[PDB]
Amino acid sequence: EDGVEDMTQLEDLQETTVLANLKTRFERNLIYTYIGSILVSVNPYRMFAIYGPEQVQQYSGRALGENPPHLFAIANLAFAKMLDAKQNQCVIISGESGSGKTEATKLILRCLAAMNQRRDVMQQIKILEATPLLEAFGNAKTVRNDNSSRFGKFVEIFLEGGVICGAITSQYLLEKSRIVFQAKNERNYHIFYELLAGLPAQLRQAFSLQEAETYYYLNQGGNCEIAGKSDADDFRRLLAAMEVLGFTSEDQDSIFRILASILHLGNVYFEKHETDAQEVASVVSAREIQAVAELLQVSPEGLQKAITFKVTETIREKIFTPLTVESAVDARDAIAKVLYALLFGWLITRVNALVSPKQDTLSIAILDIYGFEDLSFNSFEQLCINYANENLQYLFNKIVFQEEQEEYIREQMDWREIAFADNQPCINLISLKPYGILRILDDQCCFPQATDHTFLQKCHYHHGANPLYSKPKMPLPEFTIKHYAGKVTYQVHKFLDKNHDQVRQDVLDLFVHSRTRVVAHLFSSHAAQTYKAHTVAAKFQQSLLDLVEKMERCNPLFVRCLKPNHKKEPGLFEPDVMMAQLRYSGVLETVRIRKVRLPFQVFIDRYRCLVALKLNVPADGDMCVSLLSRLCTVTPDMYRVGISKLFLKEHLHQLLESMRERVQNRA
Amino acid sequence: DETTALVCDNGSGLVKAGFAGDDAPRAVFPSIVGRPRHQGVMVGMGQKDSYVGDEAQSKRGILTLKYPIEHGIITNWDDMEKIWHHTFYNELRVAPEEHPTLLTEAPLNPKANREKMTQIMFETFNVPAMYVAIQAVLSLYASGRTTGIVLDSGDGVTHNVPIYEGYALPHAIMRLDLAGRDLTDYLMKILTERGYSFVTTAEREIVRDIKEKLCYVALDFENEMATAASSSSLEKSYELPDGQVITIGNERFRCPETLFQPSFIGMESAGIHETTYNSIMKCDIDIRKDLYANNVMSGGTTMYPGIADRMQKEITALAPSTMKIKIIAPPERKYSVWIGGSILASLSTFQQMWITKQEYDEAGPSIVHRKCF
Amino acid sequence: DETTALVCDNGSGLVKAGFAGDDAPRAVFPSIVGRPRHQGVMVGMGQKDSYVGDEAQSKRGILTLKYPIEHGIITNWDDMEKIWHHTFYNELRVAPEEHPTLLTEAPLNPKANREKMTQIMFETFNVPAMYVAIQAVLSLYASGRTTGIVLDSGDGVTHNVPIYEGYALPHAIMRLDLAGRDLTDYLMKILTERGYSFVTTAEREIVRDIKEKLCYVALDFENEMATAASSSSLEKSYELPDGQVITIGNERFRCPETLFQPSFIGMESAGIHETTYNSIMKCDIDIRKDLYANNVMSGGTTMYPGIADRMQKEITALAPSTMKIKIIAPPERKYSVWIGGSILASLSTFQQMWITKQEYDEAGPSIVHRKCF
Amino acid sequence: DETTALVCDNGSGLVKAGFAGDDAPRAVFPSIVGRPRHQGVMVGMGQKDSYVGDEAQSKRGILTLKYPIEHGIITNWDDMEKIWHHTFYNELRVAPEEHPTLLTEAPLNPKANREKMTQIMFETFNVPAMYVAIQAVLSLYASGRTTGIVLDSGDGVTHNVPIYEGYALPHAIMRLDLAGRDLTDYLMKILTERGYSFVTTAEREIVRDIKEKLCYVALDFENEMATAASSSSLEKSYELPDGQVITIGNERFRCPETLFQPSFIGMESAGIHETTYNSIMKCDIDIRKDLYANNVMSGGTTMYPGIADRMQKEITALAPSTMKIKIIAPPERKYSVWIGGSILASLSTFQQMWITKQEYDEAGPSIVHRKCF
Ligand SMILES: Nc1ncnc2c1ncn2[C@@H]1O[C@H](COP(=O)(O)OP(=O)(O)O)[C@@H](O)[C@H]1O
Ligand SMILES: Nc1ncnc2c1ncn2[C@@H]1O[C@H](COP(=O)(O)OP(=O)(O)O)[C@@H](O)[C@H]1O
Ligand SMILES: Nc1ncnc2c1ncn2[C@@H]1O[C@H](COP(=O)(O)OP(=O)(O)O)[C@@H](O)[C@H]1O
Ligand SMILES: [Mg+2]
Ligand SMILES: [Mg+2]
Ligand SMILES: [Mg+2]
């Protein structure tokens, strides 16, 4: 009974105190803790009783009092808020990969399905079977994790007075640059390797596929095999899931054709041929171009022109302008990225249509979002990741400050306006329209002779006076941004090459007039839906804005999954790892926002020996608190007094401790 | 918030308009205003007092066609307003009072032209912002370079602008009042030698079409003339609107020759090659080598077949043999000014260079002289 | 503990920087700061307000080049700070706050120059220690001698320092404000006789390159002039950056002749040979014989072909025939000051001669007058 | 016996010729040669292939005018011979084979120019004697002084020559290739801002007349510009040859401002005031006080109203307040070089300084380098 559940009730909340309480809870096999209404879950790498109907009925409704912390408390709290406000709510499960967000989402899905409908569980069966497809199409091996989700899964459970209707799955913040570029010791998405490993032989002969080491889009990492993963078994399980999800053989064949077309398009090279006034890129071998055309049922000459030419087309003429080698490379990569994005969108749309709902009056949203990323070598993808995490931390801080204001109002006090410095300056530093870092990057992507060095110089010039922005001393190609989780250094090496994602109308027109129905349908839908977003950063910002716009019509609930040890040892813990996880998860932002509360009895009973010898007053209250206050000659503006709590402790705590130790120095 | 800027490259002969960020102009039409010159006899037919653009060329045979711009200077300020109104409303189908507008102008025009464009934009069309750019800088923007000398040639003027690493040398800027319109007039004059008479303004358009379709630049003039005189293999036929067929021989390459020999039309100026060489030689000795290899050609008058070959030959003859001469003539150089303006107007850093309505209200029409260039 | 000292031989024309113990300077670049003098027209191009070193010569044709040092005196104290910052951070890639720095200065400079260098080193760059040395002593250190008279000639000043067995005679120290920069100016002046006009500061660099590549010292001036006038076998060609070819004849040896006849540039001073002889004759009669055979030449201006032969001839003509005259001109005399500074800064016994930060804090910037020399 | 010498001050723009001992030049006419550029259709009209001087300006509208001299260097040696023949025969009506001739030249010209003038005088016109003088020395001769610094400015070059008690300091002689012709070109360029187009060489003369009649030098540039912008009291009208009337405002004082700010025409050089101060500071410290009070201005470009006041103001700002600054601008300074040459050529002691025909025959054209200056 030494541990505590809610750290909000504590009188002195410091990083050391939070770490000590968390490790005390973890040593007693108590995983879940409370920060106000914010849950914290440490992954134990061990099977724990986080299930069972008896837990469901124990947490059913408001009959428990939330004395023990659990995810079922978050679930039934969201349900109660929905039934009270007649409005939707969302639960945001953040944290690093492998920290336990996935099974947290599955347990939430099971709990809601058990407590809402309790008559039919077909919705949860239909939405669980789509998980392997999304995991295969949206995860990749990084230098920090062997299976990391590179996107944000948005599952929306629709409810009608306790009746579970169909669910809608959505994707957000997908990493577009991983399809064509991978760093050292990391791979592409798992789907390509699974396809190349577990495909039947005659399919491979029909698609002219080979081992993954030959392809340029996969061999960049240098380690195409994961030690501890079986690609064939996962690929067969994916086939089983598609068969369960109604995907016929023709649809699977079309998907494999599209993926093989992307892989073959990744293997096209160009040569610098000499023209009368320029250098023109020409395809080395036409075998790959013809293979892509055959797999996609498009014209080979049309594809070669869409790769090696630029079209300026007005009403009365159409001019073809030859491209350079770099421009052709960018065009090919943009085509590959748009093909992959359209395929993923089609898969998710079909999955949603399979379990399509009927009405739309109430809904519960579950977001499985990746968290802060601070590696050794740090680049554009992690910059976008940290920008998204900053925008989520904005809402996290808003919720924390709302809880602080509610605590201040609930106590019988004259509620003052509490100061609070949000992380808006970081968001403005990264993506403000005039001179934001991403805006400078977008401008440099069309400027005549821009390179990475010029972009770095522009950033240094425009943000040299920003307190959050920091320059290296020596002329190193990097810059440092002071995030909420600390200083992060970004290495500008291929920022311009990773941002070129422009697809012109000629490519869309070529792909619409295909001899296969699915590709033509996808590109017709894309053309109908399509916009001044010609770069990866602009599309990422638009997607993040859409995600945020989907998430102000509700009061979010946050679940922060942590990691006790990088070796996945069930029980071993480290203090530095806990500090790093607390910094990255934004838990310490609550401590930063707090700066300080103490019951009136505690200091009266403690510091009674500072003014008098032994002042044991029999009647306690606010009057004796004020007496002990101005007997110490302290200005009333630096502290506040109420009934018992909310006694501000900015600097009086230090001087009180100093006076206490001075008094105790003699005896 | 997301107010897309408008790029309007109103030249002497063509209007090139569109939205910033696009790859091509949305509206391209002749910069003419026509008025009836005959007698209307049917009741209700003849209620239109003006035709602008393509509708002025559909009715070409009953109208008097007039150009509001000669040699890059707007001389008729009501026809220009009509053309701008047409561009904004009937062509782009956009409301100008909610879109910043980017306009272009020749480097060495009178200041009253720029001030009047600013006043018309801010008082008649009520645009929220404005900027006036130089066409050669936009040509470099479209060409993807920061160093080079640009030879822009529309149909009003021909000018040279040498730029090095984004720095312009204003003292080396040249200007010629010899361009496509003078070529059309000279072709009209020399077509009378075979008995073809084109007099009215409606036949000027036919002569312009003949010049666009058949004329070319000869690599060397004297041997080309000797070949044309000694045979008949250089003759081509053209069909007039009413079915008559005309034939032209040496007039095919004699018309564009006035770009290199302005003496044909009675001008004392030097050819475009000598003008470019003189502009290069007015720059620093450390800039000349880079400029020699970055000769960027822009405009519709540079679209003649074989013009780049002769420009390279002439510059090589003039410049020392040590230097390397390159003539950059992209296939889309007819729209390079508009493409560069579209690239420039879409930049996020450019949003601080607009002339806002408040600045105009504070400083009068003279703000454009210090805000632009 | 193992804090390697920095040796910075910042001359009037070149900066020679490196680490103590090395055999050659790590960074050698011109001591110039350039600023744009033209109009920037492209958005984003023109955000740099200064260019230092080699990047100031890459952009030579749009910049105004200025030297922070004339005749060994720092006249611009902000450009000098820019140059030192460049040297420490962009060139050597080292943090100055953890490396002792050794600097050089001409023997007879104003004291404010040395005090200001001390203040800048100890307050702006926060070096832990400092020393200011005399360039001729470092030349002797590099030459491996303790006795000899040094004729150092960079492009700011020319000075003579006679040293015997490690003891300097300060009363015999000479100084001339005639060096490479004056030679460049005189060559620029006399190149106008053939019609070549070099005016701007960017053409000063071209003239300097011409002087370095083609100029030489004649053994005897009058017969050399007679030979050059009576034939054309002494003429050489030079190619300008834009391809033009210039030819120079007697200007090849007339330019370095002003070192022995300062009257060509309107100075009343004596030649370098007479200055060296006068400096020798101001020493003790028992020192002269050893000095006559230890004439050490240092600096870039001493790199002309045939300069040592003429110096020996002139000194032999002046000195008595009994003495033996030796002119020591090592092939690496362009870096002798830096080599000597590197040798001196790496000595273990020298660690007690640094000006530490504590001594500066105690005694102000005037500590350098008693700690150094 | 009594063979009167001829003084020919052939400048870049004007020829000033006459007889020694006279008080004014006998013949003054432009130094131009014109050739027809149109087609002659009448029989017998068009038999003249060249027009020199005033007859080239009477026929200005059908001729191409060319100058044989730019920046004080004769670039066309046949047009120069035509001009000299005109001067000797049609203007002075004298036979050159019996009169010594005195010619002038800029201080820092190429030697080939002087040698070629000597050869032409001694071989084509068969003069009995010859001398080539420096124009600033003749300006001092005309001013009646032996000590002073001369700022001569024609329309080719601007040079400074400091002379003290009849002794010249050649190392302090300055030279600028910025003069009246560049002012005419800059005025032609800036006249396009009001819509006035002057292109041909015949309109260059009209622009030159406008510059001579209306342009002036402002005492201070910024407040003058503010006054011109805030009112319309500084505008004057000019009538063109065909009756059209033009009006110019701030262009009246913006044109001569390039003498003090050469950056307007894209030159890195310093103004005439800073050039004069630099030339003074290159002289001995005991000469500067006398030079400060003897600033002699000569040439046609120094004829602007208010130029002397601004020169005095600028020199006073530059020079120490202790010194007394005097600018000597005689009303006849447009002919001071010729007056000084006439005074010098009439001296009896000067008869021993001529280059006789025998000396030329003995020593070739190179005698002029040792006989003159
Ligand atoms: N293919 C062509 N060949 C020759 N001349 C052309 C061609 N295309 C256009 N032109 C000429 O160029 C002129 C228009 O070019 P443009 O650059 O649009 O002028 P502006 O910019 O002044 O409107 C017209 O006179 C037209 O006749
Ligand atoms: N090979 C050479 N021949 C003639 N002059 C040279 C040569 N090398 C360098 N110089 C001249 O010497 C001067 C630079 O010498 P340096 O000793 O580096 O000067 P400082 O020490 O004052 O910087 C320059 O003016 C340069 O022109
Ligand atoms: N009153 C004047 N005001 C301004 N400029 C003048 C005046 N008189 C002559 N000039 C200019 O001076 C130049 C001619 O002066 P001059 O000394 O005769 O030249 P040069 O000696 O080189 O022939 C011409 O360019 C002319 O325009
Ligand atoms: Mg145009
Ligand atoms: Mg030196
Ligand atoms: Mg003169």
Residue numbers in the entry:
A (entry chain D): 1205 to 1734, 1749 to 1813, 1818 to 1889
B (entry chain B), C (entry chain A), D (entry chain C): 3 to 375
Sentences from the paper on this structure:
The motor protein myosin-15 is necessary for the development and maintenance of mechanosensory stereocilia, and mutations in myosin-15 cause hereditary deafness. Unconventional myosin-15 (encoded by the Myo15a gene in mouse and MYO15A in humans) is a plus-end directed molecular motor essential for stereocilia development and maintenance. Here, we present cryo–electron microscopy structures of myosin-15 bound to F-actin, providing a framework for interpreting the impacts of deafness mutations on motor activity and actin nucleation. We propose myosin-15 enhances polymerization by bridging actin protomers, regulating nucleation efficiency by modulating actin’s structural plasticity in a myosin nucleotide state–dependent manner.
Here, we report the cryo–electron microscopy (cryo-EM) structure of the rigor wild-type myosin-15 motor domain bound to ADP F-actin at 2.84-Å resolution, providing a framework for broadly interpreting deafness mutations in the motor domain and at the actin-myosin interface. The sub–3-Å resolution of our rigor wild-type structure facilitated building an accurate atomic model of the myosin-15 motor domain, which has not, to our knowledge, previously been structurally visualized in the absence or presence of F-actin. Myosin-15’s HLH motif (I1641-P1671) mediates the major contact with F-actin through its engagement with two longitudinally adjacent actin subunits (which we here refer to as subunits “i” and “i + 2”) along a protofilament. The first helix of the HLH includes myosin-15 residue D1647, the site of the p.D1647G mutation in the jordan allele, which forms hydrogen bonds with S350 and T351 on subdomain 1 of subunit i. In the loop portion of the HLH, a pair of hydrophobic residues (F1651 and P1652) inserts into a hydrophobic pocket formed by subdomains 1 and 3 of actin subunit i and the D-loop of subunit i + 2, where L349 of subunit i closely engages with myosin-15 F1651. In contrast to the CM loops of myosin-1, myosin-2, and β-cardiac myosin, which primarily engage in hydrophobic interactions with F-actin, myosin-15’s CM loop-F-actin hydrophobic interface is minimal and is instead dominated by a network of electrostatic interactions. Myosin-15 has a relatively short loop 3 that nevertheless mediates substantial contacts with subdomain 1 of subunit i + 2. Nevertheless, we observe a global compression of the filament along the longitudinal axis, which is centered around actin rearrangements at the myosin-15–HLH interface. Rigor wild-type myosin-15 engagement elicits rearrangements at the actin-myosin interface that are propagated through the actin structure; however, the D-loop continues to adopt two conformations. Therefore, we conclude that rigor-state myosin-15 binding maintains flexibility in actin’s D-loop but shifts the distribution toward the In conformation.
